């Protein structure tokens, strides 16, 4: 077929090769574990004798030659364009069967693996090809497990190729097993391989999953919903305060979380939107919340440092004044009465806003919402209104969990389905057309 002699004179025994490969795989199949011990030992002895006879007759090199001649082509369609449709339909299967036969030939045989250590370098050169990656990986695993000479042959380039296989083909645990075999074999460690794998896989922190301890973060909000619409009766400018009575900077090894600001719902639903409900995330960790932490303005899980007189992280005896102007969308902060040289603006105003504080363990804070719900320490800016004025006449102002589930006994925990939309929050009177 090669050398440009493509014609019907070709003598490819495609079906015969497929059948013979299946028969040989069955011939070299390892014994079942369910068998009796002595029968298993007899079958293992027969398998080892077959492997030794094949190796002495030089069948491994024949299999390698067949694999190489099949790999000169790049795809099933490319093979079929020269050999024919019937040969192309089984090119992939024949390659897989050849690799399986090689693995069965060398599996568990120290002598065969030691002899294959020489060709081990050629095997890895085609590890990246998708049609042969799994078979090459299995053969490599067998050889590395059985022969220390394979480990001695393995160098930095091969390890980097294996790590690149991780990088390109995704998360495959067989590659990790191969790396483990490279690190340790037969109770003897290879320091060079260990150092290479460490230095070439760990510092990237881009392939293996990363672990970390994260403080649980909860949120508190008043039962207030602020929204702006066309023809609505809701005031546009609002103001509230949060003052800190106590804050432990490090309750655990991770810094204490304390952010204050505003959050928006997802289109008139009372449930805060865009964020998870369990822990780890607070105000400003999504695009539905807008937070201040003393030094940074937080939004979309992104923090921008902001200047203020004697800027510092929120601590004891700190008063934060939050102002929300929905006329021209803006959110502003004032720390201890000093203005914060930063502002949120031009955010989505389709939805309901509410004051919110997010925190980890180790705080005492107090909402000041004006009136009989907390006297303001500072005079609110002109035009802005206290947050207690947004309470509906029937309801009573209350500070509660932003999410639905809190610490409680399991058999008393209330499971909640989807909640009705708070369409009555925005009072838009539409008279009958006359």
């Amino acid at each position: 077929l090669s050398k440009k002699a493509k014609a019907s004179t070709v003598d490819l025994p495609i079906e015969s090769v497929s059948l013979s490969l299946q028969d040989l795989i069955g011939y070299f199949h390892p014994p079942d574990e369910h068998l009796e011990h002595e029968d298993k030992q007899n079958r293992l002895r027969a398998l080892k004798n077959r492997q030794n006879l094949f190796q002495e007759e030089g069948m491994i090199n024949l299999v390698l030659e067949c694999i190489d001649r099949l790999h000169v082509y790049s795809s099933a369609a490319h093979f079929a364009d020269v050999a024919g449709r019937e040969a192309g339909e089984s090119w992939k299967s024949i390659l897989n069967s050849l690799y399986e036969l090689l693995a069965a030939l060398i599996r568990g045989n120290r002598k065969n693996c030691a002899q294959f250590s020489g060709s081990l370098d050629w095997l890895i050169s085609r590890l990246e090809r998708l049609e042969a990656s799994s078979g090459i990986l299995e053969v490599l695993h067998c050889v590395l497990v059985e022969s220390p000479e394979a480990l001695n042959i393995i160098k930095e380039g091969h390890i980097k190729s294996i790590i690149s296989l991780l990088d390109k083909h995704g998360r495959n645990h067989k590659v990790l097993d191969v790396l483990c075999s490279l690190c340790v074999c037969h109770g003897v460690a290879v320091r060079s391989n260990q150092h290479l794998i460490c230095d070439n896989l760990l510092p990237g922190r881009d392939l293996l999953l990363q672990t970390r301890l994260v403080n649980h973060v909860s949120s508190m909000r008043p039962n207030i919903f602020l929204g702006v619409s066309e023809g609505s009766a809701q005031y546009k400018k609002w103001y509230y305060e949060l003052m800190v009575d106590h804050t432990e900077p490090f309750v655990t090894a991770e810094a204490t979380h304390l952010r204050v600001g505003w959050a928006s719902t997802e289109g008139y639903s009372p449930y805060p939107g865009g964020g998870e409900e369990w822990g780890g995330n607070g105000v400003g960790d999504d695009l539905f919340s807008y937070g201040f932490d003393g030094l940074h303005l937080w939004s979309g899980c992104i923090a921008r440092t902001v200047s203020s007189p004697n800027q510092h992280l929120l601590r004891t005896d700190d008063v934060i004044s939050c102002c929300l102007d929905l006329s021209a969308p803006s959110i502003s902060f004032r720390i201890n009465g000093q203005p914060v040289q930063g502002m949120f603006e031009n955010f989505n105003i389709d939805g309901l806003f509410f004051p919110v504080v997010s925190f980890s363990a180790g705080i005492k804070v107090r909402f000041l919402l004006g009136g009989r719900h907390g006297e303001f320490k500072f005079l609110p800016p002109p035009g802005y209104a206290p947050c207690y004025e947004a309470v509906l006449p029937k309801e009573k102002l209350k500070v509660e969990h932003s999410r639905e589930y809190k610490q409680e006994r399991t058999y008393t925990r209330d499971l909640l389905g989807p909640t009705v939309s708070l369409t009555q929050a925005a009072f838009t009177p539409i008279p009958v057309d006359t």
Binding site: P203, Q210, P249, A253, L295, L313
Partner: protein, 107 residues
């Protein structure tokens, strides 16, 4: 060549001098936010002496120009942190390091 943001102000007068041992807590972070070191994780304050090349030099100037009791975020360029070689297995080549250093004590 390093620069410092305040987080919690210190006393503002007492600073490290030559021949003094700084006792600090720090939290080493990569520029993408991945933590690579933390003395608070080990629950053991880190002690290092000024001018003896005991630590990375950027951390050295940051701690030197911090004050007693102060907490600060230190940004260190690779040239003062680890350079192009990096730390094998921990720090990638040419990595800017962010530390959260609290200067607990001066001995």
């Amino acid at each position: 060549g390093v620069e410092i943001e305040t987080i919690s102000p210190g006393d503002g007068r007492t600073f490290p001098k030559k021949g003094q041992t700084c006792v600090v807590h720090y939290t080493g972070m990569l520029q993408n936010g991945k933590k690579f070191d933390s003395s608070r994780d080990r629950n053991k304050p880190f002690k290092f002496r000024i001018g003896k090349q005991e630590v990375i030099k950027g951390f050295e100037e940051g701690a030197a120009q911090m004050s007693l009791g102060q907490r600060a975020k230190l940004t260190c360029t690779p040239d003062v942190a680890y350079g192009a070689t990096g730390h094998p297995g921990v720090i990638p080549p040419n990595a800017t390091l962010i530390f959260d250093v609290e200067l607990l004590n001066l001995e």
